Design a protein around this ligand. Sequence first.
Ligand code: ADP
Ligand code: VO4
Ligand code: MG
Length: 762
Amino acid sequence: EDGKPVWAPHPTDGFQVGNIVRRGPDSLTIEPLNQKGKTFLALINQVFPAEEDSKKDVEDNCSLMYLNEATLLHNIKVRYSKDRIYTYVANILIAVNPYFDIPKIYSSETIKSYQGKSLGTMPPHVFAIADKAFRDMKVLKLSQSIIVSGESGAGKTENTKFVLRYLTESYGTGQDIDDRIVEANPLLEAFGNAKTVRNNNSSRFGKFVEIHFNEKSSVVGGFVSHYLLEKSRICVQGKEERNYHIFYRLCAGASEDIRERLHLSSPDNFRYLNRGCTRYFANKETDKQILQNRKSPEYLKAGSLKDPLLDDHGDFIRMCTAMKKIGLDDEEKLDLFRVVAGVLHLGNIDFEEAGSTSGGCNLKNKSTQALEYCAELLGLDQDDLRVSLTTRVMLVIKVPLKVEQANNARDALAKTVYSHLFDHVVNRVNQCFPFETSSYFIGVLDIAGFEYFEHNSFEQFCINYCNEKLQQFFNERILKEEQELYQKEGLGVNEVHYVDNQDCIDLIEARLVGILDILDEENRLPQPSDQHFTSAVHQKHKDHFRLSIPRKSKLENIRDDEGFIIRHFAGAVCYETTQFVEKNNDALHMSLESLICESRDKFIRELFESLSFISVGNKFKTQLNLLLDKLRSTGASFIRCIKPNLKMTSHHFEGAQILSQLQCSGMVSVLDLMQGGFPSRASFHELYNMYKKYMPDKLARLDPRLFCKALFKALGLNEIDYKFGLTKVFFRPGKFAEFDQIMKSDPDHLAELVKRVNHWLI
Ligand SMILES: Nc1ncnc2c1ncn2[C@@H]1O[C@H](COP(=O)(O)OP(=O)(O)O)[C@@H](O)[C@H]1O
Ligand code: VO4
Ligand SMILES: [Mg+2]
C-alpha cells in the first residue's frame, strides 16, 4: 500500500483513482481522489496498482509497468482523449470507434508512410496490421486472414474498408481493378445494410473479402463470400429502424423519369417501408436536393435523420457512380432498380375473404394498381400472380388460401426475390474483378456483430451464433494453441486461465442434441410446434451452464416453452422462440418458384436459374465451418473493435462499457499471457540453414544454436528478449523490428549479417 494511488472499482467508469487509507483482512478502505472522508470499501481482489504518470500513454499495452485490466483501460482512455483510437496488445490491435472523422489518418500520404514498416516503428494503426499481413504472405508463402471483431456499431465495417483501401492502393496496379475491390462497397451496403437502433449503417449479412495475389505479389483479383442476409427486414421493421438502404436511396435520389417509370412515391406509401422509420438521412443542404414528392409526413414533421456518414440522396449518387466505375452498364443498373420497385408494389397487395364455398380470398379491389405495377416490373402475368398468391397446389388439385396464408405467400415471394437479387449483386461484383489463378490471398472477415434488443428472435440467434464461432477461433488460435506450443517446446510459461466457449458452440451445433438439430427435427414432425421445439431444448440440456429458462417478472414474462436464455461470451441473451420453426425453413413453394422462372424478363429468370424443408440453421452452420476450415489454413491477424458508448457520440468514453468488452473479448487474458509469453518464433535450424552458404569455415558454421545467439546479439537482442525451446526460438513483445531483420532473406542482408556474426564469435 506504500503509498501510491491505486485503481479500485467504480460503477460507471470501471475503475477510479483512490488511496488506501485503512487495510482490513478481506477488504481495503479507499478514499477517492479529492474527496477525503467520503471513503468506501473494496475487496483486495478488486484493487490494482497504477502507472505513475497518469497523463502519459504507451503504444503497446505490453509496455505498461503494471499489466492489468485497470491499467489497460486507462491507457486506452488516455489515447482516446487524444483522438488516438488504435493501440496494440503485442501483435493484436485494439480499435475504439471515434464516432467522428479524424483528420488525415486515412490519407494517401498516411498509407505511404506505413508501407514496408515493421510493427512498432509507426504508431498503432489498422494499416500496420494490413502491411504485416502482406509482409507475412511474401516471407512465409502463406495465405493470410484479417479478422475484425466487435459488437454491433463497434467499427468492424469501417475498419474492413480501411484494410482494403490500404492493400489495393499499396500493392495493386494503379490501373483499373485496384479501385474496383474498394468501389464495390457502396453497392453491397446499399442492398445489405440498414438502420438498426444500434447502428445507422448496420451490416445485415457477413462477408469475407479475399484479395488474390500472383507470385510476384501483385493484386490479380478479388472474391467476396457472403453469409445469411437478414430476411424478415425485407417486409417489416420496428418503428425506429428501416429496411435496407437501397429503398430510401432510390426514393430520395431517383430522377423524376425513373420515379415515374417505377411508379415510386414517398416511403409512407409502402407496407414494406411504412411500419419502420420513413425518414431520410439528410442534412440542411442535401435536404434541398430531395424533391417534395419524395418526403413522407413523418419526415415533413420531424425533419431528417442525422449521421456524419450516411446521406440517402448523396449515397444514391455515389452508388451510381460506383456502379459505373466497376463496369455495370445503365441497363443492368435499371434492371436492379426494377426488381427493387417490383418488391415494393408486391407488398401493397391486400386480400379479403371470398364469398364462395370452400372459398379462400380475393385481392381487394383497391389493390388492383399495386398488382399491375408489380406484374409489369417483374415481367409477370397479372392473372398468374393473382393465382399464385391466393391458391396452393396440393394433391392434383388447387386449394384456396385464407387471407393470412395469402399474406404469407406474398411475403415469402418478396423475401426470395429480394434475397436472390442480393446473391445476384454479390456474384456480379465478383465478375468485376475475376482471376484465373493466384498464389496466395489476404482475406478480411467482417461479420454482423453481437446484438440484442428487448425482443430477440431467430435473426439475432443466427447472428450471435456466428459471433460465438468467431470468438472461439480467436480463443483457439491465440489463447489455446499458443500455450500448448509453449508447453510442447519446453518453455515453462505460467499457464493463463481463460474463458472458453466451446460449450456454447456444442450447445448450438452438436449432432442430434444441438439446438439446430432439434429445430430441424421439429420441421420434419407431422405437426411442427415452436413450443414443442423449445421444450425439447430445455429437456435435452437441463442444467447446462450456457442455457437457462427465462426468469419470470412480477411487473410480459416468457414461459418455459416460449423461449430460452443463451449465455454468450458477450453476455446473456433471452430469445423468444415463436416463429423459430417457420424462420428455420428456406424452401419456397413450387407455385411461387415457377411463377418467377417464367417471367418475360431474362434478368428475373436468371435470379433463379441459368413439405420440402431446407434448414436455414444447418446450411448456415455448413457455410461457417467451410469458412472456419479456410481460416485455420491461414496466418490470422486480429482487430478488436470497441464501441465507446450507446449514443453514437464522439468523446464519450464509457469506462464500464468498454471494460466489459475488453474482458469478454479475451484481451485481458491476452495481456496476462504476454507478461511471460512470446508473440514471435522461428525454427533455429531453419535460420542457420538459410545463412549457411554465406558462411566461411569458422566457429559460426559448426554450431547452429550458437550461430543464432550471435545473430541475435548482432541485431541488438539480449538474453532477456528470447528463449530457446526444443526446436524453435521465441521472442518477447517489443522486438518485432529485430525479429523482421532476423527473418529477412535478401542475399546482401545475409552476407552482411554473416560478417557481423563472425566478429561476435572471434
Ligand atoms: N474509424 C472510424 N472513423 C470514423 N467513423 C467511424 C469509424 N469507425 C466507425 N465509425 C462510425 O461508426 C459507425 C458504425 O461503424 P460500423 O463499422 O458500421 O460498425 P459495425 O461494427 O457494426 O460494422 C459508422 O457508420 C461510422 O459512422
Ligand atoms: O451494426 V454491425 O455492421 O456489427 O451488424
Ligand atoms: Mg458492419
